[PDB]
Design a protein around this motif. Structure first.
Motif, PDB file in Angstrom:
ATOM      1  N   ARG A   9       0.826  -1.205   0.000  1.00 57.00           N
ATOM      2  CA  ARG A   9       0.000   0.000   0.000  1.00 57.00           C
ATOM      3  C   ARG A   9       0.861   1.257   0.000  1.00 57.00           C
ATOM      4  N   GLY A  10       0.291   2.376  -0.433  1.00 60.91           N
ATOM      5  CA  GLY A  10       1.012   3.639  -0.406  1.00 60.91           C
ATOM      6  C   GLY A  10       2.244   3.616  -1.291  1.00 60.91           C
ATOM      7  N   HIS A  14       8.079  -3.831  -3.968  1.00 64.46           N
ATOM      8  CA  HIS A  14       8.408  -4.168  -5.347  1.00 64.46           C
ATOM      9  C   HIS A  14       7.330  -3.681  -6.305  1.00 64.46           C
ATOM     10  N   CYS A  15       7.733  -3.231  -7.491  1.00 66.96           N
ATOM     11  CA  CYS A  15       6.752  -2.763  -8.464  1.00 66.96           C
ATOM     12  C   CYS A  15       7.116  -3.201  -9.878  1.00 66.96           C
ATOM     13  N   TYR A  16       6.185  -2.986 -10.797  1.00 68.79           N
ATOM     14  CA  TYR A  16       6.354  -3.348 -12.197  1.00 68.79           C
ATOM     15  C   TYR A  16       5.580  -2.386 -13.090  1.00 68.79           C
ATOM     16  N   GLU A  17       6.175  -1.970 -14.207  1.00 68.56           N
ATOM     17  CA  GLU A  17       5.448  -1.061 -15.096  1.00 68.56           C
ATOM     18  C   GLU A  17       5.150  -1.725 -16.436  1.00 68.56           C
ATOM     19  N   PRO A  63      -3.762   4.627  -3.816  1.00 68.21           N
ATOM     20  CA  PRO A  63      -2.926   4.227  -2.684  1.00 68.21           C
ATOM     21  C   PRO A  63      -3.311   2.876  -2.112  1.00 68.21           C
ATOM     22  N   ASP A  64      -4.486   2.376  -2.455  1.00 66.95           N
ATOM     23  CA  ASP A  64      -4.924   1.040  -1.977  1.00 66.95           C
ATOM     24  C   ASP A  64      -5.953   0.475  -2.960  1.00 66.95           C
TER      25      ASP A  64
END
Length: 173
Positions: A9-10, A14-17, A63-64
């Protein structure tokens, strides 16, 4: 189009585009609790190969998962919806297989009940542009992506019933 998915959250973790369609995001992230849509209109899917709960997202911060009406934190496929310039057009029918009274729709429809005295649509023909179908009035409930083509029965747009509350043209801001 750019959407980046975040595991926590927020906008944490880890992320992915992605800048295009992806039938299976599982190899890239194990959960999704926040999203940043940089550009384009997107249809997110709870399961791979564009199945399960669908969620329509435009540019903004989320954000969520509650922010995009997510059932849970599972996003396993996404679609970049092609922008359409000009007129959006679709036809809805009383009965399945394009039978019964037909009505043509070319704008957003927050309430089919209100404008057509209909609670169910048993078949529709998307002639121009992409639309989002909502189970309930005022763009609430389960969401279903309608791309141009024939939907001879509600089963064809991945729903469990013919209940149709509202319709929205896929347009960017």
């Amino acid at each position: 189009g750019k959407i980046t998915f975040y595991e926590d959250r927020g906008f944490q973790g880890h992320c992915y585009e992605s800048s295009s369609d992806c039938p299976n995001l599982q190899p890239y992230f194990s959960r999704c609790n926040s999203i940043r849509v940089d550009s384009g209109c997107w249809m997110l899917y709870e399961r791979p190969n564009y199945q399960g709960h669908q969620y329509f997202l435009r540019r903004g911060d989320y954000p969520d998962y509650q922010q995009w009406m997510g059932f849970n934190d599972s996003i396993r496929s996404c679609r970049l919806i092609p922008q359409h310039t000009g007129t959006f057009r679709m036809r809805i029918y009383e009965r399945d297989d394009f039978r019964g009274q037909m009505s043509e729709i070319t704008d957003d429809c927050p309430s089919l009940q209100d404008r057509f005295h209909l609670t169910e649509v048993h078949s529709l023909n998307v002639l121009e542009g992409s639309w989002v179908l909502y189970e309930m009035p005022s763009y609430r409930g389960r969401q279903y992506l309608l791309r141009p083509g024939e939907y001879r029965r509600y089963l064809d747009w991945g729903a469990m019933n013919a209940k149709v509350g509202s319709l929205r043209r896929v347009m960017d801001f």
